[PDB]
Amino acid sequence: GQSTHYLAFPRASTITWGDDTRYWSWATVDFCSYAIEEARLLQVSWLDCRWSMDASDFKQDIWYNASVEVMLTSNASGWNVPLHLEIELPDGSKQESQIVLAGRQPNVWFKIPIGKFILRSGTIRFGFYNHEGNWKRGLNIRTLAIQA
């Protein structure tokens, strides 16, 4: 059946404004005996989180699925506009979908599916964004997961 091949924690990603403590915080926690850092959004307007992995990390002729695991805080706001979800293949083609997070239950981890790919070479980009001029607040990011 389907099992996880990789977990990529948000320190492996590029997060716009990620190093500015007005906008993002980083929190050290234990994940299954490994120290990780959650990326905790305080507030940002240009919300953009992208992991980049090469197509050579993966096997050929296999359907992969990706998800991002997040938590909304009690302070969540700005989620009335769709969060765009993307996988970008090396040729520039994209798997595009979206989710509206407004009104979702806070303080529970949930895994947002962000799409599927098959290889049948170069960079694959995984992640999510919303670039509208409103403030997004109160999303904590745990990990990207890639399964097959």
Added chain:
Amino acid sequence: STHYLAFPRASTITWGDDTRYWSWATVDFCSYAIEEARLLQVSWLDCRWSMDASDFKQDIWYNASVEVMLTSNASGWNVPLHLEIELPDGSKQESQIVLAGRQPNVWFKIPIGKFILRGSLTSGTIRFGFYNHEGNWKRGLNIRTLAIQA
């Protein structure tokens, strides 16, 4: 801090797809389904992950470890288990460990080396893993994950 975990389905293992030599066991890893690679017995022991240097950030010291468990059945571990990181320029971090006499049925993390990427080393394949190709038979090693930290 941990940047990546790579589970053994993402590696290449000699005989790994032959149920006479290796079993794949579905377990939960803090809410993610993973499959442990459970060695029954093999003589050509070889497990390698490949990730591109572009997956990592430049000018950062990374360390890697493999998390394993010996079973009550373990044997053949008086030989050196070779541990390796091969960078895209062919340079290698090489070390070894003797697993004979280690306590079974607990996960333990074997450090396999450290690396930093600058200039042309920032692109091209990095190989991580372990091996022993001697004519003895190794038994009862279960592999959970490769971890890459910085």
